[PDB]
Amino acid sequence: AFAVDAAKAYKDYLASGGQPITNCVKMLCTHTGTGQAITVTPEANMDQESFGGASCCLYCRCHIDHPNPKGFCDLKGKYVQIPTTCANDPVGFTLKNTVCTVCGMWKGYGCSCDQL
Amino acid sequence: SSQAWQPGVAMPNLYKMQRMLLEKCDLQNYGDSATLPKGIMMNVAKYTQLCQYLNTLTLAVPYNMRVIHFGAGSDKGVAPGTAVLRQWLPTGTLLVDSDLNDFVSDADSTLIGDCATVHTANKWDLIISDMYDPKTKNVTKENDSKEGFFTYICGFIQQKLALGGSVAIKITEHSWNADLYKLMGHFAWWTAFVTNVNASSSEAFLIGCNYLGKPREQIDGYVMHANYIFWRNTNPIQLSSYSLFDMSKFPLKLRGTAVMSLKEGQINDMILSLLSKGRLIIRENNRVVISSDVLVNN
Ligand SMILES: C[S@@+](CC[C@H](N)C(=O)[O-])C[C@H]1O[C@@H](n2cnc3c(N)ncnc32)[C@H](O)[C@@H]1O
Ligand SMILES: [Zn+2]
Ligand SMILES: [Zn+2]
Secondary structure (H helix, E strand, C coil): CCCCHHHHHHHHHHHCCCCCCCCEEEECCCCCCCCCCCCCCCCCCEEEEEEEEEEHHHHHEEEEEEEECCCCCCCCEEEEEEEEHCCHHHHHHHHHECCCCCCECCCCCCCCCCCC | HHHHCCCCCECCCHEEEEEEEECCCCCCCCCCCCCCCCCCCCHHHHHHHHHHHHHHCCCCCCCCCEEEECCCCCCCCHHHHHHHHHHHHCCCEEEEECCCCCCCCCCHHHHHHHHHHHEEEECCEEEEEEEHHHHHCCCCCCCCCCCCCCHHHHHHHHHHHHEEEEEEEECCCCCCCCCCCCCCCCCCEEEEECCCCCCCCCCEEEEEEEEEECCCCCCCCCHHHHHHHHHHHHHHHCCCCCCCCCCCCCCCCCCEEEEEECCHHHHHHHHHHHHHHHEEEEEECCCCCCECCCCCCC
């Protein structure tokens, strides 16, 4: 029954004014990529930074189990695109946000599937 | 000159041919720093420039390429160079990495422990090492050939590098090994490559291009390291980040290099010719199995 909720702890830590997790690995790239959220190579566009995925995953970074049976990580071995205005806290961004399963884009940050 | 727009500078052949005496390395640009792009780690920039330079060599790039990366951790607890290698290598390349200390990685598999505990059933197409012991950086002691992880690397190249494979092994003024230089003669070509972002350091990557499994030329490693220090001592390299801003042709081109399982008898001169050209890998193509020896204690 008991389970440590690390996402909640990090979000509360951020609200208390805590320093976001550092040393997320930012990649060099052309910034003319598709802009999709999680990719096999860096895909940042003009408004994004690309990061090594493992370094942006709260569970990888904190050495705790991944919050699912199977224990699989969506980020490790991949690249995560972060809006440049949010790239100060890539771990927080990936936690607080969701990828559209139709188009690969972050909902709220590139997904336009809800448009007329 | 135009060197500032290169990823770095490779040891010119004429310096390889010298017979210098070992001297203290005293770099003119020591203490200078390159202006890195905003928010970019030194080792991301450094591995990017190493891969940009590797793009100019005749690397064998098979399907299901096998790459192993030693010394991949950092005091940050992450693996910047592994992320760059993962970006550089074709999708589907198997990337294994390793370090003495624990870290989180984007590699397909990660072994924690001394490199001397690592064993692999299979052979590899590319070996990258950034292993370094800061204790070697001691100007008050004679600069002798170093053992430790360098002894492991030399054995690992001779036992587990596929014919036609390539290596990039980080050295410094004091972090070096004479047998590793001697092993460079068992490749079709070799160099010491200095990245432009870290050109104020005696760091280079010893690059053996296309492994041949036997001495092509005899290299004295004490003399060759002295040759390398002499080159660095007399050729100031201007620090440069320029090449980091052009990533359009960064990915390693998936060449589909042939992989064949040949026994020592069938390796004739025509086979060695194909190895030397980046056009053949010789190894088995079974499954990749690795392990790390655990010492059990009370
Ligand atoms: C220069 S740092 C590597 C930085 C890393 N390549 C990166 O991308 O940031 C050198 C690393 O070599 C590792 N190392 C030194 N000696 C080792 C040994 N004998 N076996 C395994 N790792 C070793 C250290 O643990 C250290 O993490
Ligand atoms: Zn993870
Ligand atoms: Zn969408």
